[PDB]
Amino acid sequence: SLLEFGKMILEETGKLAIPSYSSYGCYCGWGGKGTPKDATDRCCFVHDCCYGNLPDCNPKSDRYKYKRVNGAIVCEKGTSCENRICECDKAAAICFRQNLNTYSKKYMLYPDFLCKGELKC
């Protein structure tokens, strides 16, 4: 759920998922086509692929729990779906944080028409 993931992002980046990453690049939004604009965008690309590999789940809606062990992110013992959804979000948020040094304001509110050609996971 955008809830737990939203909290992960705000904790790892110090930024609100809405709207710092909700309209970013070609993949940190909704759909997604074309070449990711940068590392942060690639993060969302990989994030989509991760969700894409959970056909048996509801990555976006379904919810889960999680905690933090003296610094790092720690996914709790839930249903595999919730355990994996958690790992997909943890990797993206840490990916975001990792690449904060290249986060670009110009990639926010990115018009999708500028995103062409479906890249493969």
Short mmCIF file of N, CA and C in Angstrom, two decimals:
data_model
loop_
_atom_site.label_atom_id
_atom_site.label_comp_id
_atom_site.label_asym_id
_atom_site.label_seq_id
_atom_site.Cartn_x
_atom_site.Cartn_y
_atom_site.Cartn_z
N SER A 1 0.85 -1.22 0.00
CA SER A 1 0.00 0.00 0.00
C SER A 1 0.88 1.26 0.00
N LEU A 2 0.45 2.24 -0.80
CA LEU A 2 1.15 3.53 -0.93
C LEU A 2 1.46 4.13 0.45
N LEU A 3 0.74 3.62 1.43
CA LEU A 3 0.84 4.05 2.84
C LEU A 3 2.19 3.65 3.43
N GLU A 4 2.43 2.35 3.53
CA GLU A 4 3.69 1.84 4.08
C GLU A 4 4.87 2.30 3.23
N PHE A 5 4.71 2.23 1.91
CA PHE A 5 5.76 2.64 0.98
C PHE A 5 6.00 4.14 1.11
N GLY A 6 4.91 4.89 1.26
CA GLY A 6 5.03 6.33 1.42
C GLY A 6 5.85 6.65 2.66
N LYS A 7 5.61 5.92 3.74
CA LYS A 7 6.35 6.13 4.98
C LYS A 7 7.82 5.77 4.81
N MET A 8 8.09 4.71 4.06
CA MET A 8 9.47 4.27 3.80
C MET A 8 10.26 5.35 3.09
N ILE A 9 9.64 5.95 2.09
CA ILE A 9 10.28 6.99 1.30
C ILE A 9 10.53 8.22 2.16
N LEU A 10 9.52 8.65 2.91
CA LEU A 10 9.68 9.81 3.77
C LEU A 10 10.76 9.59 4.82
N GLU A 11 10.95 8.34 5.24
CA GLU A 11 11.96 8.03 6.25
C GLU A 11 13.37 7.93 5.67
N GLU A 12 13.47 7.39 4.46
CA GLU A 12 14.77 7.21 3.82
C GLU A 12 15.25 8.43 3.06
N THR A 13 14.31 9.24 2.58
CA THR A 13 14.68 10.42 1.81
C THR A 13 14.36 11.70 2.56
N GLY A 14 13.43 11.62 3.49
CA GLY A 14 13.04 12.79 4.24
C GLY A 14 12.04 13.57 3.40
N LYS A 15 11.64 13.00 2.27
CA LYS A 15 10.68 13.65 1.37
C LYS A 15 9.34 12.93 1.30
N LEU A 16 8.27 13.67 1.05
CA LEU A 16 6.96 13.08 0.95
C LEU A 16 6.85 12.40 -0.42
N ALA A 17 6.29 11.19 -0.45
CA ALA A 17 6.13 10.46 -1.70
C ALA A 17 5.25 11.28 -2.65
N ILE A 18 4.29 11.99 -2.07
CA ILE A 18 3.41 12.86 -2.82
C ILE A 18 3.82 14.25 -2.34
N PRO A 19 4.32 15.11 -3.25
CA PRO A 19 4.50 14.82 -4.67
C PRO A 19 5.95 14.68 -5.17
N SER A 20 6.90 14.46 -4.26
CA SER A 20 8.30 14.35 -4.65
C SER A 20 8.66 13.20 -5.58
N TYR A 21 7.87 12.13 -5.55
CA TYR A 21 8.16 10.97 -6.39
C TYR A 21 6.95 10.45 -7.16
N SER A 22 5.81 11.12 -7.00
CA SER A 22 4.56 10.71 -7.65
C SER A 22 4.36 11.18 -9.09
N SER A 23 5.25 12.01 -9.61
CA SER A 23 5.13 12.50 -10.97
C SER A 23 6.51 12.54 -11.61
N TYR A 24 7.45 11.88 -10.94
CA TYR A 24 8.84 11.86 -11.36
C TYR A 24 9.22 10.96 -12.53
N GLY A 25 9.93 11.53 -13.49
CA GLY A 25 10.38 10.78 -14.65
C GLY A 25 9.29 10.05 -15.40
N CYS A 26 9.68 8.95 -16.02
CA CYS A 26 8.77 8.12 -16.81
C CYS A 26 8.12 6.98 -16.04
N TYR A 27 8.74 6.58 -14.94
CA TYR A 27 8.22 5.46 -14.17
C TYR A 27 7.69 5.74 -12.77
N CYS A 28 8.13 6.82 -12.15
CA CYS A 28 7.63 7.12 -10.81
C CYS A 28 6.32 7.92 -11.00
N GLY A 29 5.32 7.19 -11.30
CA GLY A 29 3.97 7.63 -11.51
C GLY A 29 3.25 6.35 -11.82
N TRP A 30 2.68 6.37 -12.75
CA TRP A 30 1.64 5.40 -13.01
C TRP A 30 1.95 4.36 -14.12
N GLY A 31 1.86 4.74 -15.02
CA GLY A 31 2.25 3.85 -16.12
C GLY A 31 3.76 3.80 -16.27
N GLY A 32 4.24 4.07 -17.48
CA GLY A 32 5.67 4.05 -17.69
C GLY A 32 6.09 3.40 -18.98
N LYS A 33 6.74 4.18 -19.83
CA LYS A 33 7.25 3.71 -21.11
C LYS A 33 8.59 4.40 -21.29
N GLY A 34 9.31 4.01 -22.32
CA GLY A 34 10.59 4.64 -22.60
C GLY A 34 11.72 4.42 -21.62
N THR A 35 12.83 5.07 -21.94
CA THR A 35 14.05 5.00 -21.16
C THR A 35 13.94 5.85 -19.90
N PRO A 36 14.26 5.26 -18.74
CA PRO A 36 14.19 6.02 -17.50
C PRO A 36 15.12 7.23 -17.60
N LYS A 37 14.64 8.39 -17.16
CA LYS A 37 15.41 9.62 -17.24
C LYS A 37 16.71 9.62 -16.45
N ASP A 38 16.75 8.89 -15.33
CA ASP A 38 17.95 8.86 -14.50
C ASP A 38 17.90 7.71 -13.51
N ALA A 39 18.82 7.73 -12.55
CA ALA A 39 18.90 6.69 -11.53
C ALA A 39 17.62 6.60 -10.71
N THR A 40 17.14 7.74 -10.21
CA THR A 40 15.91 7.75 -9.42
C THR A 40 14.78 7.13 -10.23
N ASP A 41 14.69 7.50 -11.50
CA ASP A 41 13.64 6.97 -12.34
C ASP A 41 13.86 5.47 -12.51
N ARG A 42 15.11 5.05 -12.68
CA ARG A 42 15.38 3.62 -12.82
C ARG A 42 14.86 2.91 -11.58
N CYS A 43 15.02 3.56 -10.42
CA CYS A 43 14.55 3.00 -9.16
C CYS A 43 13.08 2.61 -9.28
N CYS A 44 12.27 3.51 -9.85
CA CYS A 44 10.85 3.25 -10.02
C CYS A 44 10.63 2.21 -11.09
N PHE A 45 11.50 2.18 -12.09
CA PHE A 45 11.39 1.19 -13.15
C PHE A 45 11.54 -0.21 -12.53
N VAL A 46 12.62 -0.38 -11.76
CA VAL A 46 12.90 -1.63 -11.07
C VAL A 46 11.78 -1.94 -10.09
N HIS A 47 11.22 -0.88 -9.51
CA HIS A 47 10.12 -1.01 -8.56
C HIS A 47 8.88 -1.56 -9.26
N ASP A 48 8.66 -1.14 -10.51
CA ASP A 48 7.52 -1.62 -11.28
C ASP A 48 7.73 -3.08 -11.64
N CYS A 49 8.97 -3.42 -12.00
CA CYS A 49 9.31 -4.79 -12.37
C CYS A 49 9.13 -5.71 -11.17
N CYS A 50 9.51 -5.22 -9.99
CA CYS A 50 9.40 -5.99 -8.77
C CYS A 50 7.93 -6.32 -8.53
N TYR A 51 7.07 -5.30 -8.64
CA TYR A 51 5.63 -5.48 -8.49
C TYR A 51 5.15 -6.38 -9.63
N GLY A 52 5.68 -6.14 -10.83
CA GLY A 52 5.31 -6.94 -11.97
C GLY A 52 5.56 -8.42 -11.73
N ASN A 53 6.54 -8.74 -10.90
CA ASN A 53 6.84 -10.14 -10.62
C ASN A 53 6.05 -10.74 -9.46
N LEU A 54 5.00 -10.03 -9.04
CA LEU A 54 4.11 -10.50 -7.98
C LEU A 54 2.69 -10.59 -8.57
N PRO A 55 2.51 -11.42 -9.62
CA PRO A 55 1.20 -11.57 -10.25
C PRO A 55 0.10 -12.03 -9.31
N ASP A 56 0.50 -12.80 -8.31
CA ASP A 56 -0.39 -13.37 -7.31
C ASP A 56 -0.73 -12.43 -6.17
N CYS A 57 -0.28 -11.18 -6.25
CA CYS A 57 -0.54 -10.25 -5.15
C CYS A 57 -1.19 -8.94 -5.59
N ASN A 58 -1.35 -8.05 -4.61
CA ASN A 58 -1.92 -6.72 -4.79
C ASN A 58 -0.91 -5.77 -4.14
N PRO A 59 0.24 -5.57 -4.80
CA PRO A 59 1.31 -4.70 -4.31
C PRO A 59 0.87 -3.30 -3.89
N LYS A 60 0.07 -2.66 -4.73
CA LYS A 60 -0.41 -1.30 -4.48
C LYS A 60 -1.44 -1.19 -3.35
N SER A 61 -2.51 -1.97 -3.42
CA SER A 61 -3.57 -1.92 -2.40
C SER A 61 -3.24 -2.65 -1.10
N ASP A 62 -3.16 -3.98 -1.18
CA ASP A 62 -2.86 -4.80 -0.01
C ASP A 62 -1.85 -4.12 0.90
N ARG A 63 -2.01 -4.31 2.20
CA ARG A 63 -1.11 -3.69 3.17
C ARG A 63 -0.26 -4.71 3.90
N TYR A 64 0.73 -4.21 4.64
CA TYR A 64 1.64 -5.05 5.39
C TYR A 64 2.27 -4.24 6.52
N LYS A 65 3.04 -4.92 7.37
CA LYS A 65 3.71 -4.26 8.48
C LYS A 65 5.21 -4.37 8.28
N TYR A 66 5.96 -3.56 9.02
CA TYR A 66 7.41 -3.59 8.92
C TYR A 66 8.01 -2.75 10.04
N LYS A 67 9.31 -2.89 10.25
CA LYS A 67 10.00 -2.14 11.29
C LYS A 67 11.45 -1.85 10.92
N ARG A 68 12.15 -1.16 11.81
CA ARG A 68 13.53 -0.78 11.56
C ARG A 68 14.48 -1.25 12.66
N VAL A 69 15.49 -2.03 12.28
CA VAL A 69 16.46 -2.55 13.23
C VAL A 69 17.72 -1.71 13.28
N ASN A 70 17.80 -0.87 14.31
CA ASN A 70 18.94 0.00 14.54
C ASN A 70 19.53 0.55 13.24
N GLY A 71 18.72 1.31 12.51
CA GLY A 71 19.18 1.91 11.27
C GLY A 71 18.49 1.45 10.00
N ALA A 72 18.82 0.23 9.56
CA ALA A 72 18.28 -0.34 8.33
C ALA A 72 16.80 -0.72 8.37
N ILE A 73 16.25 -1.00 7.19
CA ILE A 73 14.86 -1.39 7.05
C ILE A 73 14.75 -2.90 7.28
N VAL A 74 13.69 -3.31 7.97
CA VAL A 74 13.49 -4.72 8.26
C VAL A 74 12.06 -5.16 8.01
N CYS A 75 11.90 -6.03 7.02
CA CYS A 75 10.58 -6.54 6.69
C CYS A 75 10.14 -7.63 7.66
N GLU A 76 8.91 -7.47 8.14
CA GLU A 76 8.29 -8.38 9.10
C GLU A 76 7.82 -9.69 8.50
N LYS A 77 7.42 -10.60 9.38
CA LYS A 77 6.94 -11.93 8.99
C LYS A 77 5.44 -11.88 8.69
N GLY A 78 5.09 -11.68 7.43
CA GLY A 78 3.70 -11.64 7.04
C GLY A 78 3.48 -12.68 5.96
N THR A 79 2.47 -12.48 5.12
CA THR A 79 2.22 -13.42 4.03
C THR A 79 3.32 -13.16 3.01
N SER A 80 3.76 -14.20 2.30
CA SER A 80 4.81 -14.02 1.31
C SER A 80 4.53 -12.81 0.44
N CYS A 81 3.27 -12.62 0.08
CA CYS A 81 2.87 -11.48 -0.74
C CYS A 81 3.26 -10.19 -0.04
N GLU A 82 2.94 -10.11 1.25
CA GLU A 82 3.25 -8.92 2.04
C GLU A 82 4.74 -8.83 2.34
N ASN A 83 5.40 -9.98 2.40
CA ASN A 83 6.83 -10.03 2.68
C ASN A 83 7.61 -9.55 1.46
N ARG A 84 7.12 -9.92 0.28
CA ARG A 84 7.76 -9.54 -0.97
C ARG A 84 7.43 -8.09 -1.31
N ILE A 85 6.18 -7.70 -1.13
CA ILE A 85 5.76 -6.33 -1.41
C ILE A 85 6.65 -5.41 -0.60
N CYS A 86 6.89 -5.80 0.65
CA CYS A 86 7.73 -5.04 1.56
C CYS A 86 9.16 -4.94 1.02
N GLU A 87 9.70 -6.06 0.52
CA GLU A 87 11.05 -6.05 -0.02
C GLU A 87 11.15 -5.19 -1.29
N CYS A 88 10.08 -5.14 -2.07
CA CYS A 88 10.09 -4.33 -3.30
C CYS A 88 10.13 -2.86 -2.92
N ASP A 89 9.36 -2.49 -1.90
CA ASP A 89 9.32 -1.10 -1.46
C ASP A 89 10.63 -0.70 -0.77
N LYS A 90 11.16 -1.59 0.07
CA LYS A 90 12.42 -1.32 0.77
C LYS A 90 13.56 -1.05 -0.20
N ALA A 91 13.64 -1.85 -1.26
CA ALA A 91 14.69 -1.70 -2.26
C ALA A 91 14.57 -0.37 -3.01
N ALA A 92 13.35 0.02 -3.35
CA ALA A 92 13.10 1.27 -4.07
C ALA A 92 13.42 2.49 -3.20
N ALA A 93 12.90 2.50 -1.97
CA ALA A 93 13.12 3.61 -1.05
C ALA A 93 14.61 3.78 -0.75
N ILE A 94 15.31 2.66 -0.57
CA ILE A 94 16.74 2.72 -0.31
C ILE A 94 17.42 3.17 -1.60
N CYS A 95 16.83 2.80 -2.74
CA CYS A 95 17.37 3.19 -4.04
C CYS A 95 17.22 4.70 -4.16
N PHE A 96 16.04 5.20 -3.80
CA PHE A 96 15.79 6.64 -3.85
C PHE A 96 16.84 7.34 -3.01
N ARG A 97 16.88 6.98 -1.73
CA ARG A 97 17.83 7.55 -0.78
C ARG A 97 19.25 7.50 -1.34
N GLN A 98 19.66 6.34 -1.82
CA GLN A 98 20.99 6.17 -2.38
C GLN A 98 21.35 7.22 -3.43
N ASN A 99 20.40 7.48 -4.33
CA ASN A 99 20.60 8.43 -5.42
C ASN A 99 20.05 9.84 -5.21
N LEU A 100 19.80 10.23 -3.97
CA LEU A 100 19.28 11.57 -3.70
C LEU A 100 20.19 12.63 -4.31
N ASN A 101 21.48 12.33 -4.35
CA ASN A 101 22.48 13.26 -4.90
C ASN A 101 22.30 13.61 -6.38
N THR A 102 21.40 12.93 -7.07
CA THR A 102 21.15 13.22 -8.49
C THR A 102 19.68 13.51 -8.76
N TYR A 103 18.89 13.57 -7.69
CA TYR A 103 17.47 13.87 -7.81
C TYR A 103 17.35 15.22 -8.51
N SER A 104 16.55 15.28 -9.57
CA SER A 104 16.40 16.53 -10.31
C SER A 104 14.99 17.08 -10.29
N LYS A 105 14.87 18.37 -10.00
CA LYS A 105 13.57 19.02 -9.95
C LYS A 105 12.87 18.98 -11.31
N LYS A 106 13.64 19.08 -12.39
CA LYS A 106 13.06 19.08 -13.74
C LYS A 106 12.39 17.78 -14.16
N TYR A 107 12.54 16.72 -13.37
CA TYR A 107 11.91 15.45 -13.72
C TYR A 107 10.57 15.27 -13.02
N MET A 108 10.21 16.25 -12.20
CA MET A 108 8.93 16.23 -11.51
C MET A 108 7.91 16.75 -12.52
N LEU A 109 6.67 16.28 -12.40
CA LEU A 109 5.60 16.70 -13.30
C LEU A 109 6.03 16.37 -14.73
N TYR A 110 6.73 15.26 -14.90
CA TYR A 110 7.20 14.88 -16.22
C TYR A 110 6.07 14.45 -17.15
N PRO A 111 5.91 15.12 -18.30
CA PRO A 111 4.82 14.72 -19.21
C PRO A 111 5.13 13.37 -19.86
N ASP A 112 4.22 12.42 -19.71
CA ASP A 112 4.42 11.08 -20.25
C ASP A 112 4.60 11.03 -21.77
N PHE A 113 4.09 12.01 -22.51
CA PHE A 113 4.26 11.98 -23.97
C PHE A 113 5.76 11.93 -24.29
N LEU A 114 6.58 12.44 -23.37
CA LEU A 114 8.02 12.45 -23.55
C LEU A 114 8.61 11.07 -23.29
N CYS A 115 7.76 10.15 -22.83
CA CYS A 115 8.18 8.78 -22.53
C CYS A 115 7.63 7.84 -23.61
N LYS A 116 8.51 7.40 -24.50
CA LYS A 116 8.10 6.54 -25.61
C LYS A 116 8.95 5.28 -25.76
N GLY A 117 8.31 4.19 -26.17
CA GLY A 117 9.04 2.94 -26.36
C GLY A 117 9.20 2.09 -25.12
N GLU A 118 8.31 1.11 -24.97
CA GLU A 118 8.32 0.21 -23.82
C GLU A 118 9.60 -0.60 -23.64
N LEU A 119 10.30 -0.33 -22.54
CA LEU A 119 11.53 -1.03 -22.19
C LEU A 119 11.10 -2.29 -21.46
N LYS A 120 11.90 -3.34 -21.54
CA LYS A 120 11.54 -4.60 -20.90
C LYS A 120 12.27 -4.91 -19.60
N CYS A 121 11.52 -5.44 -18.64
CA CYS A 121 12.04 -5.79 -17.32
C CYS A 121 13.07 -6.91 -17.37
#
